[PDB]
């Protein structure tokens, strides 16, 4: 049971209302809810059917157009689960079915209650040795402060995330000591700020497309290193970079439709490691 090892993943059906009410930073083209289902279906298929991860499929709630991006409502570290208080208000009630699910999974629950503390899981990078909470439009001091308190086993440092981005809008773990990072000067700056406050040097996998830096690494047994990345079709110059890693079983995964509403790969699931 090494870094990135999981046995379970929590997912949640996306509601029909996401099509027109899901919060979105940029005004893009219309969201084809149907394709989103297809994409989301395959996404869970990879985690469960293909990687054997026991998947818990929370039902969709129409009133919570963002219930599908479960990673923002909770952060699980080893055996302890931290239900967050989303940076967005209209997303606060997603905690209910999530605390419900983690409870059923016998995880130590620690709820973020503080009326002045916001934290979206998307702003949190668990390198497997420490945490990196992005302070953004969604996450503040108290957020990281409470999270740091919840995981006293690990060092927690905060890094400034500008605009409507989240820390993981440009990075994520692509493996042990491997931090996937975007080329943007803003991306590279955020990164540098990170390692300065660390004791160990992380190897970095730089990708031209900043959002492609968002991916999923997994240490699945009989497989080894697993990395679900954005497909060549969606980001060829970034996909070509992931292609050079021969020690990782590379599984392309499209997310264009949900990306229309700021939803990336990591966003769609919570990975628990129940041993
Ligand atoms: C890798 C994280 C990217 C940002 C993020 N939390 N994405 C998922 C949430 C999207 C949702 N529409 C929101 O406005 O919160």
UniProtKB/Swiss-Prot annotation:
GO molecular function terms listed in the Swiss-Prot or TrEMBL record:
amino acid binding; catalytic activity; dimethylargininase activity; metal ion binding
Kindly, how does the activity depend on pH for this protein? Answer: Optimum pH is 8.5.
Query: Which keywords accompany this UniProt record?
Result: Acetylation, Hydrolase, Metal-binding, S-nitrosylation, Zinc
Which residues are responsible for catalysis?
166 (proton donor), 267 (nucleophile)
Which effect does the record note for changing residue 23 to A? Answer: Reduces enzyme activity and affinity for asymmetric dimethylarginine about 12-fold
Residues reported to bind Zn(2+) = 267
Q: Which residues get modified to S-nitrosocysteine?
A: 215, 267
One GO biological process term is:
arginine catabolic process
Q: Where does tissue-level expression of this protein occur?
A: Detected in brain, liver, kidney and pancreas, and at low levels in skeletal muscle.
What EC number(s) are associated with this protein in UniProt?
Answer: 3.5.3.18
Q: Give the Gene3D superfamilies listed for this entry.
A: L-arginine/glycine Amidinotransferase, Chain A
Its catalytic activity?
N(omega),N(omega)-dimethyl-L-arginine + H2O = dimethylamine + L-citrulline; N(omega)-methyl-L-arginine + H2O = L-citrulline + methylamine
Which residues take part in binding substrate? Answer: 23, 66, 71-72, 91, 138, 261
First-tier enzyme category under EC: hydrolase
> What does the record say about activity regulation?
Inhibited by zinc ions. Enzyme purified in the absence of 1,10-phenanthroline contains on average 0.4 zinc atoms per subunit. Inhibited by 4-hydroxy-nonenal through the formation of a covalent adduct with His-166. Competitively inhibited by N(5)-iminopropyl-ornithine.
Output a single Gene Ontology CC term carried by this record: cytosol
Q: How does it assemble?
A: Monomer.
Similarity remark: Belongs to the DDAH family.
Q: What does this protein do?
A: Hydrolyzes N(G),N(G)-dimethyl-L-arginine (ADMA) and N(G)-monomethyl-L-arginine (MMA) which act as inhibitors of NOS. Has therefore a role in the regulation of nitric oxide generation.
* Record protein name field: N(G),N(G)-dimethylarginine dimethylaminohydrolase 1
Q: What is the lineage of its organism?
A: Eukaryota, Metazoa, Chordata, Craniata, Vertebrata
